[PDB]
C-alpha cells in the first residue's frame, strides 16, 4: 500500500535481426520537479542482459541490489559462472516477474514497469515486460508508460510483426529508437533530453551508450506562431 515518489518515465525497446536495443532517459522526477538529472535506469546484468526500469526510483534501486545479488549468488560453487551456467535473460526475467507478482499479492508492490532485453545463449533475442501487478508480455517492440503511447506506434512501423525482425538492421533499429526518444522529449512533460541506450547483439555483444542527447530538433516553425486564434502580431 504505497505511492511513488521519485520516478522515472519511459523505457523503450525493440528487437532487430541480431539483437535488441533498449533506451531510457536519465531523469528522476519528484512530481513535476525534474529533480535528478543523472539517473541511470538501464541496468546491465552480466554481458547479455539489460533491464530497463521506469516507476519509483527507490524501488528501482532495490531491484538493482537484487540483480547484483543474483550475480554474486550464481557464481557460488559454480565453476561455469562465466560460461555455460551464466545468467540468461530468461532467468533474470522470470526471477523479477516472480518478485513483482509476489509483492503485488502482498499488497505492497514495487511500483515499477520493467523491460528485460537480452540475448539468450543460443542467439535468440529476448524482450519481455513485467510491471507492478505481475503482468507480463512480449512483443517485437515494448515500451512503458508514456512511450507505450508514442514510441510503440513509431517502432511498430519498422517491425510490425515477427517476420519483420529478420529484415531489420541495428542501424535502422537504433535510428528508430533515437527518433522515438526525440518525440518523447517533445511531448512527455516528464522527459529529459539526456538518455542512455543499450544494444545487445549476438555477435558484437553488449554495447552500452551513455550520455546521449536528443539532437536534430525542429523548433524553428515556432517563430511564425502568434496568439491563439486572431492575434496578428
Amino acid at each position: 500500500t504505497q505511492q511513488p515518489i521519485v520516478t522515472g518515465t519511459s523505457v523503450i525497446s525493440m528487437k532487430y535481426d541480431n539483437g535488441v536495443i533498449i533506451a531510457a532517459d536519465n531523469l528522476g522526477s519528484y512530481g513535476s520537479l525534474l529533480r535528478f538529472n543523472g539517473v541511470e535506469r538501464l541496468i546491465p546484468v552480466g554481458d547479455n542482459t539489460v533491464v530497463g526500469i521506469s516507476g519509483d526510483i527507490s524501488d528501482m534501486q532495490h531491484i538493482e541490489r537484487l540483480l547484483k545479488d543474483l550475480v554474486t549468488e550464481n557464481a557460488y560453487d559454480n565453476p561455469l559462472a562465466d560460461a555455460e551456467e551464466a545468467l540468461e535473460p530468461s532467468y533474470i526475467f522470470e526471477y523479477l516477474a516472480t518478485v513483482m507478482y509476489q509483492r503485488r499479492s502482498k499488497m505492497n508492490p514495487l511500483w515499477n514497469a520493467i523491460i528485460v532485453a537480452g540475448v539468450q545463449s543460443n542467439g535468440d533475442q529476448f524482450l519481455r515486460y513485467v510491471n507492478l501487478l505481475g503482468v507480463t508480455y512480449s512483443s517485437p517492440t515494448l515500451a512503458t508508460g508514456f512511450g507505450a503511447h508514442m514510441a510503440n506506434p513509431l517502432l511498430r512501423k519498422v517491425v510490425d510483426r515477427e517476420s519483420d525482425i529478420p529484415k531489420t538492421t541495428v542501424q535502422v533499429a537504433e535510428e528508430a529508437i533515437v527518433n522515438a526518444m526525440r518525440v518523447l522529449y517533445y511531448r512527455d512533460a516528464r522527459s529529459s533530453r539526456n538518455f542512455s541506450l543499450a544494444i545487445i547483439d549476438k555477435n558484437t555483444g553488449l554495447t552500452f551508450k551513455k550520455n546521449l542527447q536528443v539532437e536534430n530538433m525542429k523548433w524553428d516553425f515556432a517563430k511564425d506562431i502568434k496568439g491563439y486564434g486572431t492575434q496578428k502580431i
Binding site: 559454480n78 561455469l80 532467468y91 526475467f93 526471477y95
Partner: protein, 233 residues
C-alpha cells in the same frame, strides 16, 4: 569405549570419528546393488532390486526427480523418499522461479548440505541411504554419488550397495571404453548391465530383478522396469 561415543551424531570419538554417521554408511552396505555410469551424451543407472520372499515385489531403487534428473537408492528406502522429494522440490523451484533447469552439480551441493544438518545436531539421526544421481544439464551428462556423511562426488561411473566393489572395478577398467559410447544409448546401458553383473552371486539378473534408468541429450529421464529390460540380460 563405544556405547560412550556412539549414542548421538553430535558426539565425536577420541579419534575424530562420528559413529552414528559411520553406522549410517553401513545400512547402505547391506542394501542391494546399483550402478551409475555415463558417456558424454547419456547417463544410466542400473540397479538390482531385492525382494523379501518369492511372493513379493522387488522394491524400486530409481526415482525420477525432474525430466532431466533422477537417482538410484541403496539402504533405507524411506530416507531416499525424503531426499528425492527434497530434490524434486529444489528442481521445481528452479523451473518455477528462474525458468532454469537445476544443475546436477547444484543438486549435489544441496543434498550434501541437507545431510550435514543431520550430523551436527542432537536428537536427529543421519540419513541411512546412498544415492547415485545422474542428469543431463547445460554442461552435459553427469553422475554423482551421495553418501549420508554429506560427501557428494561427481564421477564417470560407480556403484554402491553389497558387493559394489565388483562393478566398481569393471567400470574402473572399462572407463576408456564407455566414456566414448556417444550417440548409442543401448550400448551404455549394456555397459552398465555388464558392470552390475560383476557384483552378483546369489542369482542371475532377471526381468523382475533389473531396473535401468537413462537420461541424456534427447532423452528425458526415463525408467525401464521389467518387461522392457529383457533385451539387456
Amino acid at each position: 569405549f563405544r556405547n560412550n561415543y556412539d549414542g548421538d551424531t553430535v558426539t565425536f570419538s577420541p579419534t575424530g570419528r562420528l559413529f552414528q554417521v559411520e553406522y549410517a554408511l553401513e545400512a547402505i552396505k547391506q542394501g542391494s546393488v546399483t550402478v551409475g555410469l555415463r558417456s558424454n551424451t547419456h547417463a544410466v543407472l542400473v540397479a538390482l532390486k531385492r525382494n523379501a520372499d518369492e511372493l513379493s515385489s522387488y522394491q524400486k531403487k530409481i526415482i525420477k526427480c525432474d525430466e532431466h534428473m533422477g537417482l538410484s537408492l541403496a539402504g533405507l528406502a524411506p530416507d531416499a523418499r525424503v531426499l528425492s522429494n527434497y530434490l524434486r522440490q529444489q528442481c521445481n523451484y528452479s523451473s518455477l522461479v528462474f525458468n532454469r533447469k537445476l544443475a546436477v552439480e547444484r543438486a549435489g551441493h544441496l543434498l550434501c548440505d541437507k545431510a550435514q544438518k543431520n550430523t551436527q545436531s542432537y536428537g536427529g539421526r543421519p540419513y541411512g541411504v546412498g544415492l547415485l544421481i545422474i542428469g543431463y544439464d547445460k554442461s552435459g551428462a553427469h553422475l554423482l554419488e551421495f553418501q549420508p556423511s554429506g560427501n557428494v562426488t561427481e564421477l564417470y561411473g560407480t556403484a554402491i550397495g553389497a558387493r559394489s566393489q565388483g562393478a566398481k572395478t569393471y567400470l574402473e577398467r572399462t572407463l576408456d571404453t564407455f566414456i566414448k559410447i556417444d550417440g548409442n544409448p543401448d550400448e551404455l546401458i549394456k555397459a552398465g548391465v555388464e558392470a552390475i553383473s560383476q557384483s552378483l552371486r546369489d542369482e542371475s539378473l532377471t526381468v523382475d530383478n533389473l531396473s535401468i534408468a537413462i537420461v541424456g541429450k534427447d532423452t528425458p529421464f526415463t525408467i525401464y522396469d521389467g518387461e522392457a529390460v529383457a533385451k539387456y540380460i
